[PDB]
Amino acid sequence: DAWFSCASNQVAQVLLTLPYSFSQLGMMSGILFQLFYGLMGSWTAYLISVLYVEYRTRKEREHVIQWFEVLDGLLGKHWRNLGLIFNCTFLLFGSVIQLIACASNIYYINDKLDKRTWTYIFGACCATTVFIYRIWSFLGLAMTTYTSWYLTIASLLHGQAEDVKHSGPTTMVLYFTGATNILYTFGGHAVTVEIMKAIYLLATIYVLTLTLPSASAVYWAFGDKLLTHSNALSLLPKTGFRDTAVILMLIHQFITFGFASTPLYFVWEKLIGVHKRAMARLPVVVPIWFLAIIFPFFGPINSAVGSLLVSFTVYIIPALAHMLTFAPAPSRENAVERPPRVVGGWMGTYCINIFVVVWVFVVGFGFGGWASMVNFVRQIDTFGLFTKCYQCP
């Protein structure tokens, strides 16, 4: 069940926008960033797992565990608050992106209504999730594998046009936007759901089979035209398989929205003390619906969220927590699970954590963050806020 979870927790959302980042980065840089960020995501997932195990063992020596609870148990209350805020904001923006993707996908099969009306309808539809897993874990694997291997097969059949030009990396802003989009792509394994290793690393290598051939085949066939089309289904010819992929993606995004709204809603209920009940969750829906309408961007929003929220939520905070919790010598002496010998032991783990923090801050948040924000403002200037249809001819 663990493998099924990580397969489509956060890969389906970014699968359609991957060719956009590939075109922004070039083929070589895109592949290299994909591999590097897959490795980094697997490492951060391992760090989170070991932290969870350590916290559980410490609690047992003297419900469902949550990341903020782990931080509270290990480091302190300040880290608890930091992790709670970051996780809540990340979930809110993930829901926003899910609604945006739902509207963008549903537009293509039925283009009678502009994207704005579609997001209105979908926001109204998901407002009913307030009134509202293991079995669906397998299903999500099946609905994302079809899309990943439909973009590859369909794109190759389409072939290269007589005038497609692969510009490659032309501006630093676009390059770093694509890099941050990949970073966001590989921030799904760190999701704390489905927590009781090299065996679990086989989940990320599988995710690399969905993302590598799909992004390389779509970008290769359509050249640099992907820059103006964040959603890869716009360029592909209309066919029954495209409609099947759109329907599967819509179902996946709707179910993921419903499932990932539960923790944010629980946190809101605890904060407000409500613990008839639909009214309490209404004010939480309002920010999500408004954000999707005002910023219907499909790829730029992914890049901005990955740069600002994910970079700290799933990359820097886990590394800092692992470094600080095990900093005392007694903590390492009584460690429940020693680091694997293949990664250099304690010295290697600390060096890797330092490198991860430095990288995700200098280029994962500074260069990447600046580039993503500049691109977001550029799209705001181009299509304007409350745009009727984002990237629609």
From Swiss-Prot:
This is Auxin transporter-like protein 3. It is found in: Cell membrane. Keywords: Amino-acid transport, Auxin signaling pathway, Cell membrane, Membrane, Symport, Transmembrane, Transmembrane helix, Transport. The chain crosses the membrane at residues 11-28, 31-51, 82-102, 118-133, 135-155, 173-193, 198-218, 246-266, 282-302, 304-324, 354-374. The keyword Transcription does not apply. GO terms for molecular function: auxin influx transmembrane transporter activity; symporter activity. One of its GO terms (cellular component) is plasma membrane. Belongs to the amino acid/polyamine transporter 2 family. Amino acid/auxin permease (AAAP) (TC 2.A.18.1) subfamily. It comes from the Eukaryota. The keyword Transmembrane helix applies. Carrier protein involved in proton-driven auxin influx. Mediates the formation of auxin gradient from developing leaves (site of auxin biosynthesis) to tips by contributing to the loading of auxin in vascular tissues and facilitating acropetal (base to tip) auxin transport within inner tissues of the root apex, and basipetal (tip to base) auxin transport within outer tissues of the root apex. Its main location: membrane. The gene is LAX3. Residues 52-81, 134, 267-281, 325-353 are cytoplasmic. GO terms for biological process: amino acid transport; auxin polar transport; auxin-activated signaling pathway; lateral root formation; response to auxin; root cap development. It is a multi-pass membrane protein. It comes from Arabidopsis thaliana (Mouse-ear cress). Residues 29-30, 103-117, 156-172, 219-245, 303, 375-393 are extracellular. InterPro entries: AA_transpt_TM.
